[PDB]
Amino acid sequence: PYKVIIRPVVTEKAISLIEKENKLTFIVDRRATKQDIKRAVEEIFNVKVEKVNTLITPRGEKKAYVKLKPEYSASEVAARLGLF
Amino acid sequence: MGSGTATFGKRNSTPTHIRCRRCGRVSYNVKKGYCAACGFGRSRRLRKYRWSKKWKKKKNAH
Amino acid sequence: MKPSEIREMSIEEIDAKIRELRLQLAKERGLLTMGTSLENPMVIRNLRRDIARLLTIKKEKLREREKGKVKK
Amino acid sequence: MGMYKYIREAWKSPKKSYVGELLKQRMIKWRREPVVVRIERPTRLDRARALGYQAKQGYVIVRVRVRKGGRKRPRWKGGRKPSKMGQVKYSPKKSLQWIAEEKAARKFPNLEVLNSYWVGEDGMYKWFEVIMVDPHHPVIKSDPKIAWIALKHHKGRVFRGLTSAGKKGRGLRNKGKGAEKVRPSIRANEGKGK
Amino acid sequence: MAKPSYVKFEVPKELAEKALQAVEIARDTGKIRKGTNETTKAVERGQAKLVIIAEDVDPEEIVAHLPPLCEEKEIPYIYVPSKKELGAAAGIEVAAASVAIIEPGKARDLVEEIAMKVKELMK
RNA sequence: GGGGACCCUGAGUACCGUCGGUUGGAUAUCCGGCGGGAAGCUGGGAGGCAUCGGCUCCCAACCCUAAAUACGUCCCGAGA
RNA sequence: CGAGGCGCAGGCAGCCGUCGAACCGGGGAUUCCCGAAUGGGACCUCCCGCGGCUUAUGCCGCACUCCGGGGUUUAUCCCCGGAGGGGGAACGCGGGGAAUUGAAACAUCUUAGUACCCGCAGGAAAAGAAAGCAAAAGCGAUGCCGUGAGUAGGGGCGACCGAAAACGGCAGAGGGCAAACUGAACCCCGGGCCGACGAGGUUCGGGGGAUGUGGGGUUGUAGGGCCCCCGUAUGAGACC
């Protein structure tokens, strides 16, 4: 009922989270909570979220590190959005 | 206190004054819980005076 | 985008089209941050306005409907 | 003739006419009682009606206890010229009757002072009963004999003074001689009037 | 019993029931005045045979005058502990501090008795 | 409209006495405080000392009041 | 209004608009957090007790303090209704209240009820229909302006201080209680009928109300009560 996801960031750091760690990075709502980030992801990419870690940046935005279950890989999601 | 001002001054380090929840100026003294500028914490009212201070910014704004 | 096309939709269809619009907005902004290769300021500006429109049209309808019943 | 006049006149001398036993009996109860007490019902009804009293919903009477004697002036932060130095003979411009209306009005702020009267006094205190009515309830609004207070304008009347004690205190009681400097307002002449 | 100042004497409970019972017969048959002031006129006018007086009344002032006023007027008066009962006896929904029976009817023998009983209780 | 008691007709008030505040207010301002304290229109107050008489006026102690009069936030018009 | 726009802001790029934009008016949607900030505290964040609802997350409604009415072990403990607070450009009204200075010193006096401080209201306030005025003659609310008059008057009778009545004007408006005499005839809330679903009138369940709702009446008394005689609710507005 609210905008959840601001956008993907893609960087050299993003490739390290995606490849080794199986985790995806998002810029998300600046008033977030974990409970919400996990379920929202779960529905939208159609995936299983193991875990969410959050940090609110000194850029006035909040960055969310969402860990996927190693069945739903970071790489397949990553390709769809922020790459063609 | 008098001279030897350099030798003295290691406090200020500690802060007692901020951007205020109510006004936004630099005076919400964390220790008292009082804003010097606005008067928040102290009063339901905004600080305003005949001299003034508060008024002057407002007129200036107009 | 015209307000009319939006009104012809049902309330259920409006929800599903919002999710789709926002996800498209999310996807473009990721493309922009990566570095623009699309060069349309359009997509983000129009989607932002489009998203507003579906939601306003929608809230207003439910409000109308609810009032209709009460009278009748 | 009739019942009201007898009571009112009997209260006039509170020393005679069986008032004295009552005055003494109630006064122990009252010295005990807190400085502000809400009462559902009136005391000198006879006196209250003449001021304006009705018993419809939202009309209260309240006893305010106020100290005897004048003011006692604040201590100095500077120096003073010999006339201004004095502190022990200082007496207020506002009446003690007036001071009670305002006390009552601070305590209940959504209710407004119609009028007030004196319920008697001891060596340390005076009691005044203040008649308030609420100026927000439809109940008052409909009736046109008390509808005046209801208007938005009328709140805050007690401080400005428009009540009997407020008017008497202001020195608007004549329109002739001695009313040559209080016209039409005290501060229409900058504070001259009293 | 309770209520002082103008209450000189205690009316027993049995007297009070008889008085309250005469008051109900009195409204139906005869005439009655309900309320402090009417009772006041009724005594001044000379219309009233018996005035009845509630004990709990607060402030006392409303009430205070009626026993010595009544003494001059030759009207006998008798005391009721509760007001609500008195208003009720009078035939009304609310209480009354004072009521006056202005000329009874079929009560006349009872009221004359109540009147003698009170003088016999205390002059 | 006139016929009898005319309707009773506002209390700590009016007024007096003691201390201030204030005012131009003088003995003759107004307001408070402290003490005392009326009258039932068969009455009361007022006309710049007190009191008594005449004379003339007017009803305090309950309440409200448009409009004409203040301002410059705002708009417009104006400039030895 | 209507044929370009995309604020200040002339760029690059792209976009939108006759299913009529930008723009202008009126109305409506969304309107974070803090703030009188009201559930509690805070360094603009955080926690929490109920109740509604979706399977859950999600989401919706609530508990500071008066008044008005209930609920009940009447624990004064909780529920429904209405309100308060704070702000505001100056002005206004009511309270608290200086000194430098002047008097070539200075204490009374002066500054001055000024500066400054508290309470509070509105779009104007206040005052306001005489317990007035007092050229004794003549007037019939009150502001305000001119004037009276730098007059009377006050004051180390020094310095200074300082009206009003009246006049000419302006704008104009008069009304309500308490009581006498009546005494529940009454008011508030909800529902219906009758009526253009309105005004009004009627009825039905509660609450307020004799410590008196309501009717009468108000400078001056009209006999106020009770009478009479004649027009006599005849007659005719005036108001919504």
Swiss-Prot record, chain A:
Q: Which PROSITE patterns does the record associate with it? A: RIBOSOMAL_L23
Q: Does the keyword Repeat apply?
A: no
Keywords linked to the UniProt accession: Ribonucleoprotein, Ribosomal protein, RNA-binding, rRNA-binding
Q: Which GO terms describe its molecular function?
A: rRNA binding; structural constituent of ribosome
- Gene3D superfamilies the record matches: 3.30.70.330
Residue ranges the record marks as coiled coil: none
Q: Which InterPro entries match?
A: Nucleotide-bd_a/b_plait_sf, Ribosomal_uL23, Ribosomal_uL23-like, Ribosomal_uL23/eL15/eS24_sf, Ribosomal_uL23_CS
Task: Please give the GO cellular component terms listed in this UniProt entry.
Answer: ribonucleoprotein complex; ribosome
> Which biological process annotations from GO are given for this protein?
translation
- The organism's superkingdom is given as Archaea
Pfam families named among the record's database cross-references:
Ribosomal_L23 (PF00276)
Homology family = Belongs to the universal ribosomal protein uL23 family.
| Chain's role | Binds to 23S rRNA. One of the proteins that surrounds the polypeptide exit tunnel on the outside of the ribosome.
Partners and quaternary state? Part of the 50S ribosomal subunit. Contacts protein L29.
Q: List the protein's name.
A: Large ribosomal subunit protein uL23
Swiss-Prot record, chain B:
Question: Which is an annotated Pfam family here?
Answer: Ribosomal_L37e
User: Which InterPro entries does its entry note?
Assistant: Ribosomal_eL37 (IPR001569), Ribosomal_eL37/eL43 (IPR011331), Ribosomal_eL37_CS (IPR018267), Ribosomal_zn-bd (IPR011332)
- Alphabetized UniProt keyword annotations: Metal-binding, Ribonucleoprotein, Ribosomal protein, RNA-binding, rRNA-binding, Zinc, Zinc-finger
Which Gene Ontology cellular-component terms appear in the entry? cytosolic large ribosomal subunit
Zinc finger (C4-type) locations?
Answer: 20-38
KW Zinc (keyword) present: yes
**One GO term (biological process):** translation
Co-factor(s)? Zn(2+)
Q: What does the Swiss-Prot or TrEMBL cofactor note state?
A: Binds 1 zinc ion per subunit.
Q: Where Zn(2+) is bound, by residue?
A: 20, 23, 35, 38
Q: Name one GO molecular function term.
A: zinc ion binding
Domain of life of the source: Archaea
Assembly, in brief, is: Part of the 50S ribosomal subunit.
Extract the HAMAP family matched here.
Answer: Ribosomal_eL37
Functional summary from the UniProt entry: Binds to the 23S rRNA.
The family note in this entry says: Belongs to the eukaryotic ribosomal protein eL37 family.
User: What's the protein called, per UniProt?
Assistant: Large ribosomal subunit protein eL37
Q: Which organism is it from?
A: Pyrococcus furiosus (strain ATCC 43587 / DSM 3638 / JCM 8422 / Vc1)
Encoding gene, per UniProt annotation: rpl37e
From Swiss-Prot, chain C:
Q: Which Gene3D superfamilies match?
A: 1.10.287.310
**Ribosomal protein: is it a keyword of this entry?**
yes
GO terms in the biological process aspect are: translation
**Molecular function per GO:** structural constituent of ribosome
Q: Mind telling me which InterPro entries this protein's record contains?
A: Ribosomal_uL29, Ribosomal_uL29_CS, Ribosomal_uL29_sf
Q: Which UniProt keywords apply?
A: Ribonucleoprotein, Ribosomal protein
Q: Which GO terms describe its cellular component?
A: ribonucleoprotein complex; ribosome
Summary of subunit composition and partner proteins: Part of the 50S ribosomal subunit.
Q: Report the sequence similarity comment from the record.
A: Belongs to the universal ribosomal protein uL29 family.
Q: What is this protein called?
A: Large ribosomal subunit protein uL29
Q: Which organism is it from?
A: Pyrococcus furiosus (strain ATCC 43587 / DSM 3638 / JCM 8422 / Vc1)
Name of the gene? rpl29
Curated annotation (Swiss-Prot), chain D:
Its gene is rpl15e
Can you list the GO cellular component terms from the UniProt entry? cytosolic large ribosomal subunit
**GO molecular function, a single term:** structural constituent of ribosome
A GO biological process of this protein is: cytoplasmic translation
Provide the species name.
Pyrococcus furiosus (strain ATCC 43587 / DSM 3638 / JCM 8422 / Vc1)
What family classification does the UniProt entry report for this protein?
Answer: Belongs to the eukaryotic ribosomal protein eL15 family.
**Transmembrane helix: present as a keyword of the record?**
no
Ribosomal protein recorded as keyword: yes
**Keywords carried by this UniProt record:** Ribonucleoprotein, Ribosomal protein
Annotated region Disordered: where? 165-194
Q: Which InterPro entries match?
A: Rbsml_eL15_core_dom_sf, Ribosomal_eL15, Ribosomal_eL15_arc, Ribosomal_eL15_CS, Ribosomal_uL23/eL15/eS24_sf
- Return the Basic and acidic residues bias intervals: 177-194
- This protein is called Large ribosomal subunit protein eL15
**UniProt feature, compositional bias: Basic residues:** 167-176
Self-association and partners? Part of the 50S ribosomal subunit.
